[PDB]
Amino acid sequence: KLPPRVPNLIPYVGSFVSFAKNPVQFIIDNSKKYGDVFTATILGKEMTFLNHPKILDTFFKATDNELSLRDVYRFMRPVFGTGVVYDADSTERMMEQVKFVSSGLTTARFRVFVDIFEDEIAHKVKELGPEGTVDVAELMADLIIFTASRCLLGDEVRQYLSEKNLGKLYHDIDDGISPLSFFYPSLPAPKRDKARKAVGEIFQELLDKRREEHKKHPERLLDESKMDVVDHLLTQKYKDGQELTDVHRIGILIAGLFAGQHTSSITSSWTLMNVISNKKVLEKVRKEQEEIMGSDKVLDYDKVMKMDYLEACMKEALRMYPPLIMIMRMARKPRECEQYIIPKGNILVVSPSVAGRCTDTYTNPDVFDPERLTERKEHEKFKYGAVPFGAGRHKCIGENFALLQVKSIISILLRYFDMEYIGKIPDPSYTSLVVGPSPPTRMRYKLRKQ
């Protein structure tokens, strides 16, 4: 029959209050009370939490006409744009648009991306000086504004960042997104909308300029190392032959940038903080760096590909502090889950955060221990033991780019600086759509070469 329910505090509002304090502890506590599968009413939505790795196969492999992503993420429409990704006309159109972004994330582009990271960090160290203190979360966000933008859109974007305040516009859009919008997609957000329109105008101009650059220098279209997402959007069509609109191209780029920034800056923050705060982990990370770097003075792709221990450190931060804490779908048909049937219209929920603290999978889950993955392989105990990037048909298409960006940034920063974190590693703050550490996140730095 139906899964057990979390008793409602009030009708309609349901369990919103305990939920919004800490959605992760809400799921944990209620798992303990009600088991692997339970339902809560939350601001009018029937939400059915799936809380053990064991049962997740049917969730991750269902077709979009059974478990719809578009029904639950459509709320992002005022950020991304009408007709884009989860507001696309169909599952099919969404998948095609996602492929246009994946199409600028090639090996050839990754070799160039390393150079971009080196270049932006070198600019940034001029601000930072020989020593100081800096907020970790801000530093990473600031770096990734410039790196993600240039990686996805090309170098032509940088003059807008440097001269037309584009980075402030991003913040205006992105602080304009409340997680509450998931329940109330029509919440007014006029500052967000003003900024989104401004970025729209700038990106329209970037498209217009690229078009005539394609005329002046069509060889660009033949060089895989110089082809970016803007180039692919300007020269591709849907499979059925329908051309894209410039409004669709703008929205895809904004969606791509949004994806390319927040989850990465947050992950590089939690990763760096935990690395520099743990003497044994820092030793190993630096020993690995010194071996891979050898006599060379700058990074390249092949070097990053060898940073296995640093990668493990990132995965361990992803276990502990996954930035997307809830993966959702709407049930378009009733769904069997173990002994239960989950009603049509219910929203099924999987939490990477809950999974990462599951003590059936992880021993001492509150401890940052990259060796739990590299030596003890604790993630491998279940097919869905670790799902920070999703799984199945909708698994993150950005995973390798995020790995590259975060490993590269943390590698280059280490090369430049000794760094120590000030204070206790914070708790996550659940006030934002993409979850990051509670501010402030400060560290001291000092340059390693006079």
Residues lying near ligand HEM in the complex (CB under 6 A): 69, 98, 101, 256, 259-260, 263-264, 267, 323-324, 327, 388-390, 394, 396-398, 401-402
- Residue 304 makes CB contacts below 8 A (sequence gap 6+) with 114, 404, 407, 408, 411
Q: Does 83 interact with ligand X2N (rule: CB under 6 A)?
A: no
Q: Least distance from C-beta 350 to ligand HEM, angstroms?
A: 8
Among 430, 436, 443, 445, binds ligand X2N (CB under 6 A): 430
Q: In whole angstroms, how close is the CB of 287 to ligand X2N at the nearest point?
A: 31
Q: Choose between 113 and 258: whose C-beta lies nearer to ligand X2N.
A: 258
Q: Residue 324 or 337: which CB sits closer to ligand X2N?
A: 324
Residue 78 interacting with ligand X2N (CB under 6 A): no
Tell me how far apart the alpha carbons of residues 40 and 16 are, in angstroms, rounded to a whole number.
9
Stated as kind and residue range, the H or E segment containing 116 is helix 107-128
- Helix 399-416 / helix 279-293 crossing angle, nearest 10 deg: 90
58 binds Ca ion (CB under 5 A): no
Contact 38, 3 (CB under 8 A): yes
Distance CA 123, CA 143 (A): 10
Pick between residue 9 and residue 367 the one whose CB is nearest to Ca ion.
Answer: 9
Within 321-430, residue ranges assigned H as helices are: 352-356, 371-374, 399-416
Q: Pick from 4, 35, 179, 200: which binds ligand X2N (CB under 6 A)?
A: 179
Query: Rounded to an integer, what distance in angstroms lies between the CA atom of residue 40 and that of residue 6?
Result: 5
> Is residue 396 close enough to count as binding ligand X2N by CB under 6 A?
yes
Phi, psi of 272 (to 5 degrees): -55, -45
d(CA 26, CA 351): 11
DSSP 3-state of 67? strand
| 9 near Ca ion, rule: CB under 5 A | yes
Least Å distance, CB 289 to ligand X2N, is 27
Residue 17 touches which of ligand X2N, Ca ion, ligand HEM, none (Cβ within 5-8 Å per kind):
Ca ion
| Binding span for Ca ion by CB under 5 A among 7-15, 219-227, 302-310, 400-408 | 7-15
267 binds, among ligand X2N, Ca ion, ligand HEM, none (CB under 5 to 8 A by kind): ligand HEM
Q: How far is the CB of 401 from Ca ion (least distance, A)?
A: 25
Of 269 and 445, nearer to ligand HEM (C-beta) is 269
For position 85 contacting ligand X2N by CB under 6 A, the verdict is yes
Interface stretch with Ca ion, choices 2-10, 120-128, 154-162, 332-340 (CB under 5 A): 2-10
Counting contacts by CB under 6 A, is residue 259 touching ligand X2N?
Answer: yes
Closest CB to ligand HEM belongs to which residue?
A: 398
Query: How many other C-beta atoms lie within 10 A of the C-beta of residue 271?
Result: 28
Q: How many CB atoms lie within 10 A of CB 253?
A: 28
One of 48, 274, 351, 405 touching Ca ion (CB under 5 A): 351
Angle CA(28)–CA(32)–CA(38) in degrees, nearest 5? 80
Contacts 24+ apart (CB under 8 A), 298-305: 298/118, 299/114, 299/117, 299/118, 299/408, 299/411, 299/412, 300/111, 300/114, 301/107, 301/110, 301/111, 301/113, 301/114, 301/404, 303/411, 304/114, 304/404, 304/407, 304/408, 304/411
Say how many Å lie between the first and final Cα of the chain, rounded: 69
Q: Choose which of 3, 23, 370, 388 interacts with ligand X2N (CB under 6 A).
A: 23
48 binds, among ligand X2N, Ca ion, ligand HEM, none (CB under 5 to 8 A by kind): none
Residue 354 binding result from ligand X2N, ligand HEM, Ca ion, none, given CB thresholds of 5 to 8 Å by partner type = Ca ion
- How many Cβ atoms are within 10 Å of 291's Cβ, its own excluded? 10
Indicate whether 20 belongs to the interface with ligand X2N (CB under 6 A). Answer: yes
> What angle do the packed helices 166-175 and 190-216 form, to 10 degrees?
140
Residue 258 binds to ligand X2N (criterion: CB under 6 A):
yes
Which of 38, 60, 73, 100 binds ligand X2N (CB under 6 A)? It is 73
Q: Which residues pair with 133 in a beta bridge?
A: 444
The binding site for ligand X2N (CB under 6 A) comprises 20, 23, 73, 85, 178-180, 182, 255, 258-259, 263, 324-326, 396, 398, 430-431, 433
